[PDB]
């Protein structure tokens, strides 16, 4: 049953690749970790090294603090009982201050103050991680596309936790930190706003989320179908088109009448994915600030 190239047949191992140097401060690179044969069946077997500078340390510290602040609250909700902790783990919730406190930072610890403290830690962790994605690319002389795309995900997170609560007048509009509680929040959000299915920016966000799975299925399958001509070596196929790039393009031209280039498909890809959270963020931003009822708003505009 013909080789499908989904799993590697024969793994090979050589000395560890320590990576390109360019302008990277090599002081901050770790050593090499162990090779994983298990990972080697699907992708590369090598683990590490990793780069850990000031921003990465600041990010991991803030992130652990965020995690530990939620965990301490969860233990307190479980009356310090480990069995209650495991039993009710998905039900614990660190909720935002009640609406009475408005945007003040003066909520008592057990009445929303811990939420503000956790949110501060998560704010530092994500933004310093963002700075890291920019500086890691700059140190290798790369384009900044990864930082720009990350900003789109950051935008929706900023709208949910920070910009929309501020525009609403209350931290109590923000999202709680809990497995089940943030699902309940999501469902209540749609009900309170008159059915999010009728928010056109929600509809667009769904088309791009579906579209992202459509496109990666198409692109991943296409590349595997032309890997017998070295198609996954996409950079050199951009610099010097080979029969892999031509057959890939012709498959889609013959199928649906038009096609991409090896470079150009990755522009379709980045935009398809970043538009998910770009449109989503706008849809949430407008809910409650401008539109109270998406269904009723929908009926008066067709």
């Amino acid at each position: 049953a013909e080789y499908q190239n989904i799993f590697t047949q024969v793994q090979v191992r050589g000395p560890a690749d320590l990576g390109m140097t360019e302008d990277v401060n090599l002081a901050n690179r770790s050593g090499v970790g162990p090779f994983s044969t298990l990972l080697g069946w699907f992708g590369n077997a090598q683990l590490g090294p990793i780069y850990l500078g000031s921003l990465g340390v600041l990010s991991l510290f803030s992130g652990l603090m965020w995690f530990f602040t939620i965990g301490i609250w969860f233990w307190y909700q479980a009356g310090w009982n480990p069995a209650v902790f495991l039993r009710d783990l998905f039900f614990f919730s660190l909720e935002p201050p009640a609406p009475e406190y408005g945007l003040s930072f003066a909520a008592p610890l057990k009445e929303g103050g811990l939420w503000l403290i956790a949110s501060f830690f998560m704010f530092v962790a994500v933004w310093s991680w963002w700075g890291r994605t920019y500086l890691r690319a700059q140190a290798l002389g790369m384009g900044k596309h990864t930082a720009w795309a990350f900003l789109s995900a950051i935008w929706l997170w900023m709208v949910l936790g920070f910009i929309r609560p501020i525009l609403m007048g209350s931290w109590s509009e923000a999202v709680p930190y809990g497995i089940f509680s943030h699902l309940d929040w999501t469902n209540n959000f749609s009900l309170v706003h008159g059915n999010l299915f009728y928010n056109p920016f929600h509809g667009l966000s769904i088309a791009f989320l579906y579209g992202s799975a459509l496109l990666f299925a198409m692109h991943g399958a296409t590349i595997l179908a032309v890997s017998r001509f070295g198609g996954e070596r996409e950079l050199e196929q951009i610099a010097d088109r080979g029969t892999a790039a031509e057959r890939a393009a012709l498959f889609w031209r013959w199928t649906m009448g038009f096609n991409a280039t090896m470079e150009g498909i990755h522009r379709w890809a980045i935009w398809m994915a970043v538009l998910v959270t770009l449109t989503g963020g706008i849809g949430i931003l407008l809910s409650g600030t401008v539109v109270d009822n998406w269904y009723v708003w929908g009926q008066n505009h067709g």
Binding site: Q77, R87, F216, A225, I270
Partner: protein
């Protein structure tokens, strides 16, 4: 019209049915026997939609809706205007989707490439069939399927979901969502990585795949690699649609309660069901 490099690929052969009878192109489009079959099912399905739009009495595309038969019709045939057009359109849509996949196979053969693409497309057909065929038949009526209208099929989604409480609690639905999110994350990362290597900082030469691996190792300590990322993209998108169909085929067939109940097993196990405090004691 041809792409500048296209001529040498436009050879005879590769068809599964019909020999050289349909082995030709219309513009960029390859035809083949299953191109003819696709056109047939598509044309007829679009005619029936037109017919049903007249019966409904509107030309507005946002209002046209072709409904399946009432639950009382069970799995039986229905009159055209009382659910029968929906039944015939579903046959045409199925015919067109399967014909499309087999036309893709013929294109694969003529070009000498792997069959991954029509294989991946088959998962989407399977998910469509889960909602209009497999699940309705297991529940005993065509009316459990969704209507064909831009906005009515969203109403169907909301109606079906809230029937079982907050559908969020369906555990296969959680896994599918995780794959959909992780896929869009991987797609953004992969498109960004390639473009950032092909289009580096001003004043720089093109980067190499080694720079892509170095970037991801510096960032998170691991690079899956150029082949692995395309395998991963395939696996993420297909697993998302697989668990999507799984989460619907079990709803209303082996599960009838609010989905939040499913976890309430974990809550009321006897060695902690009665411990006071927490959330569930």
């Amino acid at each position: 019209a041809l792409l500048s490099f296209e001529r040498k690929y436009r050879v005879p052969g590769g068809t599964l049915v019909g020999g050289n009878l349909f082995d030709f192109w219309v513009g960029p489009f390859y035809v083949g026997f299953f191109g003819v079959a696709t056109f047939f099912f598509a044309a007829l399905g679009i005619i029936l939609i037109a017919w049903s739009a007249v019966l409904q009495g509107t030309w507005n595309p946002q209002l046209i809706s072709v409904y399946p038969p009432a639950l009382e019709y069970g799995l039986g045939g229905a009159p055209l205007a009382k659910g029968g057009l929906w039944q015939i359109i579903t046959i045409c849509a199925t015919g067109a989707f399967v014909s499309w996949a087999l036309r893709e196979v013929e294109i694969c053969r003529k070009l000498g490439i792997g069959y991954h693409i029509p294989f991946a497309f088959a998962f989407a057909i399977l998910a469509y069939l889960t909602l209009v065929l497999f699940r309705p038949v297991m529940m005993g009526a065509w009316g459990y399927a969704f209507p064909y209208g831009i906005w009515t099929h969203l109403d169907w989604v909301s109606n079906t979901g809230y029937t079982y409480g907050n559908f969020h609690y369906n555990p296969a639905h959680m896994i599918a969502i995780t794959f959909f999110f992780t896929n869009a994350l991987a797609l953004a990362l992969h498109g960004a990585l390639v473009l950032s290597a092909a289009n580096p900082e001003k004043g720089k030469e093109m980067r190499t795949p080694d720079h892509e691996d170095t970037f991801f190792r510096d960032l998170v300590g691991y690079s899956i690699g150029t082949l692995g990322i395309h395998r991963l993209g395939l696996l993420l998108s297909l697993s998302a649609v697989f668990f999507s169909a799984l989460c619907m085929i079990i709803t209303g067939t082996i599960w009838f309660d609010q989905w939040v109940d499913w976890w309430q097993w974990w809550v009321k196990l006897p060695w902690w069901a009665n411990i006071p405090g927490g959330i569930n004691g």
